[PDB]
């Protein structure tokens, strides 16, 4: 696979690794999303150690209002983080 | 870096690799977009060999109407292709 193709498979992989832990296997619940950020975005995002922060991140991400982050929402999250990095480091 | 972090860096890298070739160093013109898809998405998307296909792809991802693909628009493109790969495997 190319570098881009690899990167895409890696986004699918990490989503599944966290979404399948509990409840809906295809959605991130707040605790799944917290572990994903803390473990996998430890350099791009401040560690989450407060319920209020987990809450705010889900509120921000959850466009369909079911209190979970689905794959489309996770893509949007990936784009906002990646964009932030893009901008920040130039 | 985590696999997710490395993937995000990979998106910014490839984008810069192609956007930097001609004209606007920070946006993809049609020629740069065609070569990105052809070289970097050769295992996920059919090879582009017709002007009308690159025209149509650009029209599709060019949401601000400048005839180029900026990083934000490239991220929506990445999300489209990733989603398709996701579905494909399932
Ligand atoms: Ca879940
Ligand atoms: Ca949701
Ligand atoms: Ca360019
Ligand atoms: Ca545009
Ligand atoms: Zn899935
Ligand atoms: Zn840039």
Curated annotation (Swiss-Prot), chains A, B:
Quaternary structure, from the entry: Dimer of either two alpha chains, or two beta chains, or one alpha and one beta chain. The S100B dimer binds two molecules of STK38. Interacts with CACYBP in a calcium-dependent manner. Interacts with ATAD3A; this interaction probably occurs in the cytosol prior to ATAD3A mitochondrial targeting. Interacts with S100A6. The S100B dimer interacts with two molecules of CAPZA1. Interacts with AGER. Interacts with PPP5C (via TPR repeats); the interaction is calcium-dependent and modulates PPP5C activity. Interacts with TPPP; this interaction inhibits TPPP dimerization.
PTM sites of type N-acetylserine: 2
The protein's name in its UniProt record: Protein S100-B
Binding locations of Ca(2+) 2: 62, 64, 66, 68, 73
InterPro entries the UniProt entry points to: EF-hand-dom_pair, EF_Hand_1_Ca_BS, EF_hand_dom, S100-B, S100/CaBP7/8-like_CS, S100_Ca-bd_sub
GO terms of biological process kind: adaptive thermogenesis; astrocyte differentiation; axonogenesis; cell adhesion; cellular response to hypoxia; central nervous system development; learning or memory; long-term synaptic potentiation
GO CC annotation terms, alphabetical: ciliary basal body; cilium; cytoplasm; cytosol; extracellular region; extracellular space; intracellular membrane-bounded organelle; microtubule cytoskeleton
Residues the record lists as Blocked amino end (Ser) modifications: 2
Domain EF-hand: 13-48, 49-84
Tissue/organ expression: Although predominant among the water-soluble brain proteins, S100 is also found in a variety of other tissues.
Any one GO molecular-function label of the UniProt entry: tau protein binding
Cell location: Cytoplasm; Nucleus; Secreted
Domain of life: Eukaryota
One Pfam family here: EF-hand_1
Organism: Homo sapiens (Human)
Residues annotated to bind Zn(2+): 16, 26, 86
Cited function: Small zinc- and- and calcium-binding protein that is highly expressed in astrocytes and constitutes one of the most abundant soluble proteins in brain. Weakly binds calcium but binds zinc very tightly-distinct binding sites with different affinities exist for both ions on each monomer. Physiological concentrations of potassium ion antagonize the binding of both divalent cations, especially affecting high-affinity calcium-binding sites. Acts as a neurotrophic factor that promotes astrocytosis and axonal proliferation.
Amino acids binding Ca(2+) 1: 19, 22, 24, 27, 32
Keywords: Acetylation, Calcium, Cell adhesion, Cytoplasm, Metal-binding, Nucleus, Repeat, Secreted, Zinc
């Amino acid at each position: 696979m190319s570098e881009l193709e690899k990167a895409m498979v890696a986004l699918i992989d990490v989503f599944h690794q966290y979404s399948g832990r509990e409840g809906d296997k295809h959605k991130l619940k707040k605790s799944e999303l917290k572990e994903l950020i803390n473990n996998e975005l430890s350099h791009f995002l401040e560690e989450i150690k407060e319920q209020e922060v987990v809450d705010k991140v889900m509120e921000t991400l959850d466009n369909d209002g079911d209190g979970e982050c689905d794959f489309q929402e996770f893509m949007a999250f990936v784009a906002m983080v990646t964009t932030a990095c893009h901008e920040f480091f130039e």
